[PDB]
Curated annotation (Swiss-Prot), chain A:
Protein name: Monellin chain B
Functional note: Taste-modifying protein; intensely sweet-tasting protein.
Oligomeric and partner information: Heterodimer of an A chain and a B chain.
Pfam families named in the record: Monellin (PF09200)
Species per Swiss-Prot/TrEMBL record: Dioscoreophyllum cumminsii (Serendipity berry)
Practical uses of the protein: Natural monellin has not been mass marketed to the food industry, primarily due to the challenge of large-scale purification of the protein which is relatively sensitive to heat or acid treatment.
Marked site (Blocking, abolishes the sweet taste) residue numbers: 41
Residue ranges that the Swiss-Prot or TrEMBL entry lists as coiled coil: none
Annotated S-S bridges: none
Entry keywords, A to Z: Taste-modifying protein
Swiss-Prot record, chain B:
Applications (biotechnology): Natural monellin has not been mass marketed to the food industry, primarily due to the challenge of large-scale purification of the protein which is relatively sensitive to heat or acid treatment.
Organismal lineage: Eukaryota, Viridiplantae, Streptophyta, Embryophyta, Tracheophyta
Name of the protein this chain belongs to: Monellin chain A
Subunit-level organization: Heterodimer of an A chain and a B chain.
Organism domain of life: Eukaryota
Coiled coil: none
UniProt KW keywords: Taste-modifying protein
Task of the protein: Taste-modifying protein; intensely sweet-tasting protein.
UniProt cross-references to InterPro entries, sorted A to Z: Cystatin_sf (IPR046350), Monellin (IPR015283), Monellin_A (IPR000828), Monellin_A_sf (IPR038580)
Pfam families in the record: Monellin
């Protein structure tokens, strides 16, 4: 799915040390001394839209072509991937 | 993952862009755009942005709940929340 349970090895423990260190920067508690991270540890893989791809039946010089275009999400920057033809009508 | 969109002005505008970019390379002589017809397909491309972690961490022998965000591209980490003390899982 999008959520995953990971193990409590060095990488996970190091996350724990990071939490405590950043918490001491704020100070909502007393200076904290890192002990250990215990199970369970949850990992959420965050997905984001990069861009889009379009498939298009397009007439040019009275010839049927199949054109594909990629568009970026943030910038709407467009690019032509492929342009083949003539091809048969749907 | 695949989606059908109508052949309205926006779609036609994609057609105008495809022909124009083809003229720049030129693998089909000078072409003149006419129109785009059905069906038009749209595939939405997703990419990993980062990660969020839920931790049970002992600090000064108290059990806290910590949430940390980690970015995919930059490896940048941030502490989102830090509550406690909390009961053992």
């Amino acid at each position: 799915g999008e959520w995953e349970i990971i193990d409590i090895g060095p990488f996970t423990q190091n996350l724990g040390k990071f939490a405590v260190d950043e918490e001491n920067k704020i100070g909502q508690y007393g200076r904290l001394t890192f002990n250990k991270v215990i199970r369970p540890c949850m990992k959420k893989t965050i997905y984001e839209i990069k861009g889009y791809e379009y498939q298009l039946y397009v007439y040019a010089s009275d010839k049927l072509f199949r054109a594909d275009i990629s568009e970026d999400y943030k910038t709407r920057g467009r690019k032509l991937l492929r342009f083949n033809g003539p091809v048969p009508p749907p």
